[PDB]
Amino acid sequence: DIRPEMKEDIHDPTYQDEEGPPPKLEYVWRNIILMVLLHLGGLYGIILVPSCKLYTCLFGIFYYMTSALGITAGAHRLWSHRTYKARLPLRIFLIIANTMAFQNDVYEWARDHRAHHKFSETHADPHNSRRGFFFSHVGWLLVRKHPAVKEKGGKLDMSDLKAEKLVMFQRRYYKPGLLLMCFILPTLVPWYCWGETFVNSLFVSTFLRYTLVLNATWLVNSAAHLYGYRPYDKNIQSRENILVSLGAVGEGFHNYHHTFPFDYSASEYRWHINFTTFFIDCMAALGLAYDRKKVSKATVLARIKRTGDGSHKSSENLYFQ
Ligand SMILES: CCCCCCCC/C=C\CCCCCCCC(=O)SCCNC(=O)CCNC(=O)[C@H](O)C(C)(C)COP(=O)(O)OP(=O)(O)OC[C@H]1O[C@@H](n2cnc3c(N)ncnc32)[C@H](O)[C@@H]1OP(=O)(O)O
Numbered sequence: 001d002i003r004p005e006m007k008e009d010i011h012d013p014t015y016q017d018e019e020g021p022p023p024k025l026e027y028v029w030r031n032i033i034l035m036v037l038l039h040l041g042g043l044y045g046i047i048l049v050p051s052c053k054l055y056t057c058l059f060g061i062f063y064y065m066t067s068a069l070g071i072t073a074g075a076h077r078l079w080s081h082r083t084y085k086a087r088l089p090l091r092i093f094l095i096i097a098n099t100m101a102f103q104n105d106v107y108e109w110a111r112d113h114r115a116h117h118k119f120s121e122t123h124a125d126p127h128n129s130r131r132g133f134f135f136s137h138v139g140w141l142l143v144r145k146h147p148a149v150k151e152k153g154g155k156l157d158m159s160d161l162k163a164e165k166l167v168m169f170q171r172r173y174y175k176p177g178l179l180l181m182c183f184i185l186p187t188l189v190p191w192y193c194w195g196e197t198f199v200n201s202l203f204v205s206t207f208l209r210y211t212l213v214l215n216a217t218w219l220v221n222s223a224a225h226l227y228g229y230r231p232y233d234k235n236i237q238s239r240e241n242i243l244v245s246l247g248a249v250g251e252g253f254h255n256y257h258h259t260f261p262f263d264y265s266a267s268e269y270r271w272h273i274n275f276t277t278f279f280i281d282c283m284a285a286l287g288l289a290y291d292r293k294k295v296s297k298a299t300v301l302a303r304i305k306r307t308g309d310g311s312h313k314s315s316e317n318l319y320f321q
């Protein structure tokens, strides 16, 4: 019990789907067209990529990287799971980086996630993997949420995020933030700083980039809940897919993370394909993050022995941490 600070992300196994047949999905047509156009505009930006100035590509990667941290170190580990404490400067960089990533504000992000952990693979899970790959990748954003999500998730404590002034600052002014950070500024910066043509900055440095931060994130719900190993808990659906960790800068050890949702590393190994933990460990070094809550090797090993599927004994002691 390394974090009794909060407890609204611990898996509740007593909950199961027991409300009769699931109501039919309700399509939301505003989202469908935008998500279509986006992945078109992202796809069109791909054929444009060879005709881009070098700085435009690097800027895109940096922007992909910064938005990544705004979700992995920011929304996921700091605010949804409370796995460490951050000082004002880092939290300001994170709250901006989050706004470039455009995955709703932080209060609405963590609520959907805190429900995803507690009520995983149920109708109260906002991206119920058991509905299918498409649903949990992008489809959950195109149809209405099961009443279980609203009902059960509404009973989760969000007092901590309610009582943080910076998370609520984002919430109040989120609409102008995302327009500036996700679409306007990463288009005008390449357009001015090194003269990338507007058609390229819009479709490479914005639509493709956002489409790649978007899809890289959705792979943690779709792929990580189907393909991979289960060294730590064979009884859940979260997996250790290494590719996911690569694109999602560390959040690919979903089987560990769903078992140990309080570990600040989201993984057994601190720096292994986990650029996010590395970043978090640098802020630690600079005195802007402390109380990095990692799980003891005895608790992990005993948990592998209990509910593990036994694939771990091909990674047993390959890094110190
Ligand atoms: C490279 C980085 C890698 C990162 C790796 C991360 C791994 C982390 C671990 C695992 C993965 C986590 C990643 C998932 C996050 C991805 C998020 C995005 O990508 S968003 C893209 C842009 N934004 C949209 O596209 C919005 C589209 N969504 C919508 O339009 C609606 O939300 C929609 C259609 C999905 C649902 O429609 P409805 O009307 O049925 O539900 P509604 O409108 O959202 O909520 C209304 C009321 O329902 C309650 N309610 C909803 N959700 C609740 C909850 N979770 N708990 C309690 N009550 C809830 C609340 O009362 C809420 O009202 P009140 O928000 O307070 O004003």
Ligand SMILES: [Fe+3]
Residues within 6 Å of the ligand: 116, 220, 221, 225, 238, 254, 258
């Ligand atoms: Fe998950």
Ligand SMILES: [Fe+3]
Residues within 6 Å of the ligand: 076, 080, 081, 113, 117, 257, 261
């Ligand atoms: Fe999580």
